[PDB]
Amino acid sequence: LATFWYYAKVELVPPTPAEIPRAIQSLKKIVNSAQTGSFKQLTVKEAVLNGLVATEVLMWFYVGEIIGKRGIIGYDV
Amino acid sequence: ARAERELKPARIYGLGSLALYEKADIKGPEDKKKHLLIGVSSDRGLCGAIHSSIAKQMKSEVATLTAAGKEVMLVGIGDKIRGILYRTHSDQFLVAFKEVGRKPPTFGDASVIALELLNSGYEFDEGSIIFNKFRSVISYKTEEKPIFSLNTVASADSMSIYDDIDADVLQNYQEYNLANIIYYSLKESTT
Amino acid sequence: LQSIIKNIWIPMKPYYTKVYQEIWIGMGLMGFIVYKIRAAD
Amino acid sequence: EVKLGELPSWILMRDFSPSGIFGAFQRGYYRYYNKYINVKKGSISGITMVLACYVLFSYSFSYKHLKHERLRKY
Amino acid sequence: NLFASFIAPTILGLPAAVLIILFPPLLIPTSKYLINNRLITTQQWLIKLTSKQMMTMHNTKGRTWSLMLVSLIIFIATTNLLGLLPHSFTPTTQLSMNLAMAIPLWAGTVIMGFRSKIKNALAHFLPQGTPTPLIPMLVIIETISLLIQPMALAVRLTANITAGHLLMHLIGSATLAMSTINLPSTLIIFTILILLTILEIAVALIQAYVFTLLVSLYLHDNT
Amino acid sequence: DIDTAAKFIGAGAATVGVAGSGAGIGTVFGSLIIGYARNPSLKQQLFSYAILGFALSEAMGLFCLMVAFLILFAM
Amino acid sequence: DIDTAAKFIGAGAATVGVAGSGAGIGTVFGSLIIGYARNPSLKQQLFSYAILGFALSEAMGLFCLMVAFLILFAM
Amino acid sequence: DIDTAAKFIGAGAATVGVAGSGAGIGTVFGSLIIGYARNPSLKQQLFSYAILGFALSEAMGLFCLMVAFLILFAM
Amino acid sequence: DIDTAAKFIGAGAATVGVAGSGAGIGTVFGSLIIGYARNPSLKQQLFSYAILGFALSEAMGLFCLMVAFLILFAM
Amino acid sequence: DIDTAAKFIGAGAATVGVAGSGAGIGTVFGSLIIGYARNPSLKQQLFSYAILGFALSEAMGLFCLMVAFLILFAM
Amino acid sequence: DIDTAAKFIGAGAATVGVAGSGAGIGTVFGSLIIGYARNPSLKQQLFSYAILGFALSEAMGLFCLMVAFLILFAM
Amino acid sequence: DIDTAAKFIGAGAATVGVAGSGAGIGTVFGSLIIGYARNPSLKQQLFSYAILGFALSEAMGLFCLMVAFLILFAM
Amino acid sequence: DIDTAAKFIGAGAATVGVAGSGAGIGTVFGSLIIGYARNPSLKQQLFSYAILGFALSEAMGLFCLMVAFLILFAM
Amino acid sequence: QMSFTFASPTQVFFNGANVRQVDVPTLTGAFGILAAHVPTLQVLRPGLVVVHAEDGTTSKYFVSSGSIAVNADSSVQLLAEEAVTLDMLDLGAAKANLEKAQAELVGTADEATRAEIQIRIEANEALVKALE
Amino acid sequence: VAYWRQAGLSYIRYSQICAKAVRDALKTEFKANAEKTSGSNVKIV
Amino acid sequence: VPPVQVSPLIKLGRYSALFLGVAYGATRYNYLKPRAEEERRIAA
Amino acid sequence: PPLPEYGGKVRYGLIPEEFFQFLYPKTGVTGPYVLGTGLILYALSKEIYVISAETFTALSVLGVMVYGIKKYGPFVADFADKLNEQKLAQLEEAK
Amino acid sequence: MPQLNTTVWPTMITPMLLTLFLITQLKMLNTNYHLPPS
Amino acid sequence: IPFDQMTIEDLNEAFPETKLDKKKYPYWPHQPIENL
């Protein structure tokens, strides 16, 4: 009912223009790990967790595609 | 004393047994030849005019039926009636019973009497029972009730309105009512 | 050959040897019928 | 066990024999059974999860017939 | 197109029908314990009730088939029940499995009735009080009946379950084609589909019990 | 074309088979009436049996309609 | 044309299926008569059941008529 | 012409459907006989129910005849 | 010619509809037997009802034969 | 000769109508069994009624056969 | 030839008429069961009546088969 | 070819005749239920009669199937 | 082509034969209702018999459907 | 409209009472009687007897044998030889006597004695089934 | 016609056996009094 | 239960991917519409 | 060995609380739910889950299953428990 | 009708026998009902 | 041992009456169906 918005105001909100430095900080962390090749230390539990978050943002992209074509089931044309 | 207390439910039950033949109005066959006559009394004496009344009614009805050619068979529930009737009426006699009066009559007594009336090979075309209907501590009256055979109840016209009726259910009902009327007579004659 | 015929064949022996014998004859008949079907097809 | 190990030789270290994979499936079955079914005051969810995985497996092999009833064309 | 749910399922080229037929026993765990969880409790209760409802009429020789008949009813019931799940393959819709379940059991029954019992076995082809001028005909009857008992078994499963399933499919299609048209009619068709699903559950259970009871009656006729 | 024509004819034929389920439902509910007139205290249970019978009888009828449409549209 | 001809034939065929609902209604109301003759005090309730049975039986019949018209006009 | 021919065939087919109303009327009046033999005092009321049943059964039959003529003359 | 042929076919079809009146007469007289075995004193009245039922059942049958001849000779 | 062909078809159709008399004779004699099991003393009279019913039921059946031959030979 | 096919069709049609004798035999033996459950002492006599009924019912059925073969081989 | 076509049609027709044996088996086992509810002590003997009836009814049905195949394969 | 057309017609015809199993199931469960209203203590056993009857009746019906598909797909 | 009379050789349960329904275990099956029920007369077998009073309450008794008569004036007479309220019976004695009677049945060989054994058997079976 | 009628019994005997079996299944709190109120003492001569 | 603020990289990825998805959906819609209509016309 | 008294805490009878408590650290509470919603939308948009008659048969069987559970779940549960307690009482009585 | 495709017929016959006659019966044999105590 | 950690074999050891007579009845359910 109304608890969904109670949580969404925390986590389902656009990122404020103040926290993008921390976003690119985490991005530079992960690209440093890719540069050194140290991602082998990440035990596969956290690797699976990161893969799940990646599929989550990929589903976000796909919901963007389905809202950007004004149709749910495939391309209406 | 106690019999006047045990009579009320016995009266209700016995008269409820005979409510059918009163509502359906079974009239009995006035053309048949075989007749059964049960007389209810006790084994004890000093009763006054009980056994004398029962014997007088049994003798009168035996005479009235034999005058019409009907072959009568007699039954006496009690030793007094058998003793009073055995001399003058010995050829006309089927079964007698004993040990009545010392203990109050129960439905076991009636079930017995009915059984040994049915396992006798005497298919009676009709019957009567003679007892002493109790009216008050001073007054009683020798009354008589009918006993219909299977063919009387089955061949009656007014029995056409009754349902799921065949010869088997009528046989069972007639046997149970023989027991019921014997029990009713036994409960009325002990007062 | 251990724990197979210990858990699969010992309990089923009284049934596979004496009780289901006519069942085995019927299975032979069924295989014969299925083969005669799949032949003419 | 996995979710803790980070070595690819583990993939070779495992017993890929008939008895090996048989014991693996049996261990998984007994783990599931003891976690969800082999408990007093148990739930129906321990069976509904199996039924849901079975419906997924059923939709898997029926996709080769279900891709011929596609609504769109792309 | 329409019968794509009765075609032998293949996943990655392998005959998944093997796994689909091997699954139903996986839903009946067993335990050496004396007091165990709710699933095995209810399942043991149901197995006892079924054994009592089926095996009571038999003599001591017929009650040796108790394992076989309880196993048969459990297998057929679980297969028919799992067959109601979406996109599932129901191996009792196949004439193969039903024929291979019906011919062996009926044939073993009649063979165990002919091995011993042979005089009473040949006598059962004639009712007791049959009149003389009707003796011969009423012999050519029974045998053909006795010859169509296995068929009538297998078909009675197949042609039932299949039909049921196909029905639930066709009506379903209706709902789909009715989605973009009158909505109250869509809801009415969907309620029809729900009632039909309930009927199909009842028919799955009843068909299992029917197959098992007919095999049991054949067995009692020869024991 | 002869295919559409015979599809119509076969649909009508397969539809004829609903008469038996009509008669069966009639018999089921008439017997229900009789059995309830005999032992009304069992009413609920009787009704249960009635429903079961109905479900099966009309089931057969629906099978007929199945074939009817299976000839009219699916071919 | 053969399509109209077979439409007539299939309409007649599908119409044949009303005989079963006729017989079912006959059975329902005959049983109602019998059950009311045994326990008239339940009359109203009996009639209720009768109506229910009728509704279902004729329902099947109407289904038949459905197919009849579905072949006669809708095609 | 094929239209007249199939009109004859479909009229015969639709006419076949009077058998069910024949059987239903038979059942209704047989049950009436039985129920009157059981409780003759309800005779009149029983007859009433009988009539009702008849009216419905033959109604279905007339529907069949309807379609028969609807194919034989109205087309 | 196709008209005579379909006239034969439709006459046979419309004739099929006498089966229901056969079954209805069977039911009527069987119920008459039962009800007379139950209350023979009502015999005459029972027979009366029987006749009535028969008259109606066979009536339907005759209607069928009507259509049969109406297709065989009147057209 | 489409005429001979349709004569065969219509003869078969008109022959179909003996099923109702078969069922009616079955019902008559089953009811006779029941009514005799109830009141065996009326046996003879019951049998009489049975015969009557049979005579009428099979009569209808013969009518069907009539039409069958009336299409097979008389035309 | 149309004359060599219509024989097949008419044989099938005339064969349809065995359903009534099937139903009649079913009714006869069911009533026999009921009447024997009522009065088992009459068993033999009951069975006699049963046989008679059967003989007549199946007789009608055989008549149907008669016509079937009379169209299939004798023509 | 017309021969194969009419073979299909006649096979379907001859198959129609199993409805009567279906109804007869239904009647037999329903009567068995009733007669066992009346006198359960005769159960075994009752079942015997039931089997007999079944054997005959389905026999007729098989005869129908006979003709069906006799037209479908043997010709 | 005439083969597909007659396959449709024969499938519809063979499907017609489910009416008898519909009526038989109706009769079985109606008798079950009656016999349970008479002797409810035998309920379970009665139900057993009912199931048996059902199994056989619907069996015949399935046979009909068998032939239906045997003409519709297997040829 | 229905005047009930339920009685025993020594006890009167009802007497001209106005009840709405009465269930009885007739030798030819069970049935429930209401007002204006078709007139009938039957003999009973061991079983329950449920009497529904107009207030919607049900009294349950157990009758061994006797007779029932529904009359044209909606007057019902139910006379039982031994009528006992349910709480006066116990299940263990019923089951034990049933087992004894079954044993004596498998043991006996004479026809009439076997019939009496069977009668007592069914009596005890109805006892157990009616109790619980 | 029940089985015991074929055996030669009578509804008096059936009723006796049934009432006896119902009296035996009484709890001992009532069994003595119920056997007393329903016993038989008559003797045939 | 107290909610938890998602890491900023995850939210930025979410919303950037969402906007890229809207853009890609519009682009492919406009790209497929002409060929779709042309094949619909050429089929007849 | 005695049996534990409770199972695995499955939400909606399909997903155990392990998944939600494992995804809670990085994506909060609505994380798993929005992941599932995105998965469903991507499935029924890219024609991974084709819509057909099986869709509505699936909805009907799922509705019947959920209704049967929600209706006769307490009955079956306390019935199994009562069977166990009856057996335990009988056994302890025989001790 | 795919039910008449006699090519995949063994694939249906073989596991059923492995399931109806061995596995399910081996699970039934482990369903033992002991005698009630005194 | 409490009755919730006891095996049917352990119960047969504690109460030798509860054993199933695998000699008079070798086939499942190792006992007559009425006692089941």
Curated annotation (Swiss-Prot), chain C:
According to its record, what are the GO cellular component terms? Answer: fibrillar center; mitochondrial inner membrane; mitochondrion; proton-transporting ATP synthase complex
Please tell me whether the keyword Mitochondrion is annotated for this protein: yes
Q: Does the keyword Magnesium apply?
A: no
Q: Name one GO biological process term.
A: proton motive force-driven ATP synthesis
Q: Which UniProt keywords apply?
A: Membrane, Mitochondrion, Transmembrane, Transmembrane helix
Q: Where are the transmembrane segments?
A: 21-38
| Topological type in the membrane | Single-pass membrane protein
- Provide the protein's localization: Mitochondrion membrane
Describe, as the record does, how this protein assembles with itself and its partners. Component of the ATP synthase complex composed at least of ATP5F1A/subunit alpha, ATP5F1B/subunit beta, ATP5MC1/subunit c (homooctomer), MT-ATP6/subunit a, MT-ATP8/subunit 8, ATP5ME/subunit e, ATP5MF/subunit f, ATP5MG/subunit g, ATP5MK/subunit k, ATP5MJ/subunit j, ATP5F1C/subunit gamma, ATP5F1D/subunit delta, ATP5F1E/subunit epsilon, ATP5PF/subunit F6, ATP5PB/subunit b, ATP5PD/subunit d, ATP5PO/subunit OSCP.
Regarding protein family, the annotation reads: Belongs to the small mitochondrial proteolipid family.
Q: What does this protein do?
A: Subunit j, of the mitochondrial membrane ATP synthase complex (F(1)F(0) ATP synthase or Complex V) that produces ATP from ADP in the presence of a proton gradient across the membrane which is generated by electron transport complexes of the respiratory chain. ATP synthase complex consist of a soluble F(1) head domain - the catalytic core - and a membrane F(1) domain - the membrane proton channel. These two domains are linked by a central stalk rotating inside the F(1) region and a stationary peripheral stalk.
From Swiss-Prot, chains F, G, H, I, J, K, L, M:
* PTM sites of type N6,N6,N6-trimethyllysine: 43
The GO biological-process annotations, alphabetized, read as:
proton motive force-driven ATP synthesis; proton transmembrane transport
* Organism this protein belongs to: Homo sapiens
What assembly does the database describe for this protein?
A: Homooctamer; the c-ring consists of eight c subunits forming a circle, and each subunit adopts a hairpin shape. Component of the ATP synthase complex composed at least of ATP5F1A/subunit alpha, ATP5F1B/subunit beta, ATP5MC1/subunit c (homooctomer), MT-ATP6/subunit a, MT-ATP8/subunit 8, ATP5ME/subunit e, ATP5MF/subunit f, ATP5MG/subunit g, ATP5MK/subunit k, ATP5MJ/subunit j, ATP5F1C/subunit gamma, ATP5F1D/subunit delta, ATP5F1E/subunit epsilon, ATP5PF/subunit F6, ATP5PB/subunit b, ATP5PD/subunit d, ATP5PO/subunit OSCP.
Recorded protein name is: ATP synthase F(0) complex subunit C1, mitochondrial
Q: What is the protein's known function?
A: Subunit c, of the mitochondrial membrane ATP synthase complex (F(1)F(0) ATP synthase or Complex V) that produces ATP from ADP in the presence of a proton gradient across the membrane which is generated by electron transport complexes of the respiratory chain. ATP synthase complex consist of a soluble F(1) head domain - the catalytic core - and a membrane F(1) domain - the membrane proton channel. These two domains are linked by a central stalk rotating inside the F(1) region and a stationary peripheral stalk.
GO MF, one annotated term: lipid binding
Could you confirm whether the keyword Ion transport appears in this record? yes
Where is the site Reversibly protonated during proton transport? 58
What residues of the intact protein does this structure contain? 62 to 136 of 136
Q: Which family does it belong to?
A: Belongs to the ATPase C chain family.
From Swiss-Prot, chain N:
Q: Which GO terms describe its molecular function?
A: proton-transporting ATP synthase activity, rotational mechanism; structural molecule activity
The PTM N6-succinyllysine maps to 100, 129
Cell compartments where the protein resides:
Mitochondrion; Mitochondrion inner membrane
Query: Looking at the record's lineage, which domain of life comes first?
Result: Eukaryota
Major place of residence = mitochondrion
A cellular-component GO term for this protein = mitochondrion
Does NAD count among this protein's keywords? no
Q: What is the effect of changing residue 46 to L?
A: In MC5DN5; no effect on protein abundance; decreased mitochondrial proton-transporting ATP synthase complex assembly; decreased aerobic respiration in patient cells homozygous for the mutation; partial loss of function confirmed by complementation assays
Q: What keyword terms does UniProt attach to this protein?
A: Acetylation, ATP synthesis, CF(1), Disease variant, Hydrogen ion transport, Ion transport, Membrane, Mitochondrion, Mitochondrion inner membrane, Primary mitochondrial disease, Transit peptide, Transport
Does this entry carry the keyword Transmembrane? no
Function, please? Subunit delta, of the mitochondrial membrane ATP synthase complex (F(1)F(0) ATP synthase or Complex V) that produces ATP from ADP in the presence of a proton gradient across the membrane which is generated by electron transport complexes of the respiratory chain. ATP synthase complex consist of a soluble F(1) head domain - the catalytic core - and a membrane F(1) domain - the membrane proton channel. These two domains are linked by a central stalk rotating inside the F(1) region and a stationary peripheral stalk.
Q: By what name is this protein known?
A: ATP synthase F(1) complex subunit delta, mitochondrial
Q: Origin organism of this chain?
A: Homo sapiens
* The gene coding this protein: ATP5F1D
Curated annotation (Swiss-Prot), chain Q:
Coiled coil start-end: none
Q: Which residues carry this modification: N6-acetyllysine?
A: 95
Where, per the database record, does this protein carry N6-succinyllysine? 87
Q: Which family does it belong to?
A: Belongs to the eukaryotic ATPase B chain family.
Lineage, top-rank taxon, reads Eukaryota
Organism lineage reads as:
Eukaryota, Metazoa, Chordata, Craniata, Vertebrata
Name assigned to this protein: ATP synthase peripheral stalk subunit b, mitochondrial
Where can this protein be found? Mitochondrion; Mitochondrion inner membrane
Subunit notes for this chain?
Answer: Component of the ATP synthase complex composed at least of ATP5F1A/subunit alpha, ATP5F1B/subunit beta, ATP5MC1/subunit c (homooctomer), MT-ATP6/subunit a, MT-ATP8/subunit 8, ATP5ME/subunit e, ATP5MF/subunit f, ATP5MG/subunit g, ATP5MK/subunit k, ATP5MJ/subunit j, ATP5F1C/subunit gamma, ATP5F1D/subunit delta, ATP5F1E/subunit epsilon, ATP5PF/subunit F6, ATP5PB/subunit b, ATP5PD/subunit d, ATP5PO/subunit OSCP.
- From which organism does this entry originate? Homo sapiens (Human)
Its function? Subunit b, of the mitochondrial membrane ATP synthase complex (F(1)F(0) ATP synthase or Complex V) that produces ATP from ADP in the presence of a proton gradient across the membrane which is generated by electron transport complexes of the respiratory chain. ATP synthase complex consist of a soluble F(1) head domain - the catalytic core - and a membrane F(1) domain - the membrane proton channel. These two domains are linked by a central stalk rotating inside the F(1) region and a stationary peripheral stalk.
